[PDB]
């Protein structure tokens, strides 16, 4: 027949990008995290939106907190990816270097997906120090840039980079962190000790057993799986839940 047909539903295995093409992008929180009173950002943010008591509560892991400097993408994006990660972990590096850029260009920059970082140090003293440096960067609104710079420096490393203070200071400089006195102080002192302990306890309480780990909407993914697998799950979740509406009672 001499017509172009409107797309109709297909089995999910062959649905391609039907999910994202029919989803409604978020329009709020496009200018990054909301600042604190003094202009800096709340780098003590961690944890879920609300306690999880059963599998029914899986969406509670997604904060959708507009003040969150550990998040990228619209606060009302129809899909959130919650990530648990370690800055010394080569699988975390691989996901950051090889999967996340595609997700950023295809989904996050289009308002469809929000990605929220959660600390889960599994690799000991260098991982803890890196997480502290990450929070120091987030306090100055440069977490994503710090994350990207650190992991790019690990793009050819199959083991742990064993980054130390001068490495973190370099990543911070490259990320455009403006107050290096504050960064170097907070990256080393007790400022974030408590929140990092609590963040680890939270992740362990979920039973997250290794890094990276993801909650993609309602779906759990363990490890740096192929990029194509992340895309399939993203599309499936967007097909299922194309829109998000912030509750009026919040």
């Amino acid at each position: 027949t001499q017509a172009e047909k409107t797309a109709t539903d297909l089995p999910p295995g062959f649905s391609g990008k039907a999910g994202s093409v029919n989803a409604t992008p978020g329009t709020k929180g496009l200018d990054g995290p909301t600042p604190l009173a003094d202009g800096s950002f709340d780098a003590t943010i961690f944890g879920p939106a609300k306690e999880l008591k059963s599998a029914d509560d899986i969406l509670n892991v997604h904060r959708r907190n507009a003040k969150d400097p550990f998040a990228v993408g619209s606060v009302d994006a129809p899909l959130v990816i919650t990530e648990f990660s370690d800055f010394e972990c080569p699988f975390c590096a691989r996901w950051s270097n090889q999967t996340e850029p595609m997700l950023m260009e295809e989904y996050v920059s289009k308002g469809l997906v929000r990605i929220e970082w959660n600390d889960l140090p599994v690799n000991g003293e260098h991982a803890l120090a890196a997480a502290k440096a990450g929070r120091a960067a987030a306090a100055q609104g440069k977490f994503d840039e710090f994350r990207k710079a650190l992991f790019e420096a690990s793009r050819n490393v199959s083991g742990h980079p064993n980054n130390t203070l001068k490495d973190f200071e370099r990543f911070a400089r490259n990320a455009g962190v403006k107050d290096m006195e504050r960064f170097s102080r907070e990256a080393q002192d007790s400022t974030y000790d408590e929140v990092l302990a609590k963040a680890a306890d939270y992740a362990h309480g979920l039973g997250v057993s290794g890094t990276p780990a993801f909650v993609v909407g309602t779906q759990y993914i363990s490890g740096a799986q192929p990029t194509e697998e992340f895309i399939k799950v993203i599309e499936s979740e967007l097909k299922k839940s194309p829109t998000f509406s912030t509750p009026s009672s919040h």
Side-chain angles (χ1 to χ4, degrees), residues 12 53 58 64 68-69 107 145 154 173 203 205:
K53 294 301 266 63
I58 185 59
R64 300 185 177 272
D68 189 353
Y107 300 107
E145 295 87 347
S154 293
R173 291 200 314 276

Short mmCIF file of all heavy atoms in Angstrom, two decimals, residues 12 53 58 64 68-69 107 145 154 173 203 205:
data_model
loop_
_atom_site.label_atom_id
_atom_site.label_comp_id
_atom_site.label_asym_id
_atom_site.label_seq_id
_atom_site.Cartn_x
_atom_site.Cartn_y
_atom_site.Cartn_z
N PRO A 12 9.15 -6.79 22.87
CA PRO A 12 10.19 -5.90 23.41
C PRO A 12 11.58 -6.13 22.81
O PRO A 12 12.34 -5.17 22.64
CB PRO A 12 10.17 -6.22 24.90
CG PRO A 12 8.72 -6.56 25.16
CD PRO A 12 8.31 -7.37 23.94
N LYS A 53 11.31 -1.06 52.50
CA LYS A 53 10.85 -2.11 53.41
C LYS A 53 10.58 -3.43 52.69
O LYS A 53 10.47 -4.48 53.33
CB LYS A 53 9.60 -1.66 54.16
CG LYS A 53 9.83 -0.49 55.10
CD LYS A 53 10.88 -0.83 56.15
CE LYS A 53 10.26 -1.36 57.44
NZ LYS A 53 9.51 -2.64 57.27
N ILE A 58 11.07 -0.41 45.48
CA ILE A 58 12.33 -0.27 44.75
C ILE A 58 12.57 1.16 44.24
O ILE A 58 13.71 1.64 44.26
CB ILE A 58 12.41 -1.27 43.56
CG1 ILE A 58 13.78 -1.21 42.86
CG2 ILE A 58 11.28 -1.03 42.57
CD1 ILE A 58 14.95 -1.53 43.78
N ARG A 64 15.70 11.97 43.57
CA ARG A 64 15.08 13.10 42.87
C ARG A 64 15.10 14.35 43.76
O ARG A 64 14.08 15.03 43.94
CB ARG A 64 13.64 12.77 42.45
CG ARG A 64 13.50 11.58 41.50
CD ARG A 64 12.04 11.45 41.07
NE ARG A 64 11.78 10.39 40.09
CZ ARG A 64 11.86 10.54 38.76
NH1 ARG A 64 12.26 11.70 38.25
NH2 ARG A 64 11.58 9.52 37.95
N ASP A 68 20.73 17.92 44.98
CA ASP A 68 21.73 16.84 44.91
C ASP A 68 22.86 17.15 43.92
O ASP A 68 22.64 17.17 42.72
CB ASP A 68 21.01 15.54 44.50
CG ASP A 68 21.89 14.28 44.58
OD1 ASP A 68 23.11 14.37 44.82
OD2 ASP A 68 21.32 13.19 44.37
N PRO A 69 24.10 17.41 44.43
CA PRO A 69 25.19 17.66 43.48
C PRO A 69 25.79 16.38 42.90
O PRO A 69 26.77 16.47 42.14
CB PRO A 69 26.24 18.38 44.33
CG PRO A 69 26.06 17.75 45.69
CD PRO A 69 24.55 17.53 45.82
N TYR A 107 20.08 10.08 26.22
CA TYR A 107 18.97 10.14 27.18
C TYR A 107 19.03 11.29 28.18
O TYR A 107 18.04 11.98 28.39
CB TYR A 107 18.88 8.83 27.96
CG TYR A 107 18.64 7.63 27.09
CD1 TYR A 107 19.65 6.70 26.86
CD2 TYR A 107 17.41 7.42 26.48
CE1 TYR A 107 19.44 5.60 26.04
CE2 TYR A 107 17.19 6.33 25.66
CZ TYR A 107 18.20 5.42 25.44
OH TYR A 107 17.98 4.34 24.62
N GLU A 145 32.20 16.57 36.74
CA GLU A 145 33.44 16.87 36.05
C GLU A 145 34.64 16.16 36.71
O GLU A 145 35.54 15.66 36.02
CB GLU A 145 33.66 18.39 36.01
CG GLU A 145 32.61 19.15 35.19
CD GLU A 145 31.34 19.55 35.96
OE1 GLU A 145 31.08 19.07 37.09
OE2 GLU A 145 30.58 20.39 35.41
N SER A 154 41.86 6.67 34.35
CA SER A 154 41.93 5.23 34.55
C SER A 154 41.52 4.43 33.31
O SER A 154 41.31 3.22 33.40
CB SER A 154 41.05 4.80 35.74
OG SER A 154 41.54 5.29 36.98
N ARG A 173 41.44 20.34 39.58
CA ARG A 173 41.84 21.46 38.73
C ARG A 173 41.26 21.31 37.33
O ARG A 173 40.68 22.25 36.78
CB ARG A 173 43.37 21.58 38.65
CG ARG A 173 44.04 22.03 39.93
CD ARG A 173 45.42 22.59 39.64
NE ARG A 173 46.16 21.71 38.74
CZ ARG A 173 46.85 20.65 39.13
NH1 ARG A 173 46.90 20.34 40.43
NH2 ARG A 173 47.48 19.90 38.25
N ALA A 203 24.18 1.18 51.52
CA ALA A 203 24.36 0.27 50.39
C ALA A 203 24.44 -1.17 50.86
O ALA A 203 23.87 -2.07 50.24
CB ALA A 203 25.61 0.64 49.59
N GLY A 205 23.11 -2.38 53.49
CA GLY A 205 21.76 -2.72 53.92
C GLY A 205 20.87 -3.14 52.77
O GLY A 205 19.94 -3.93 52.95
#
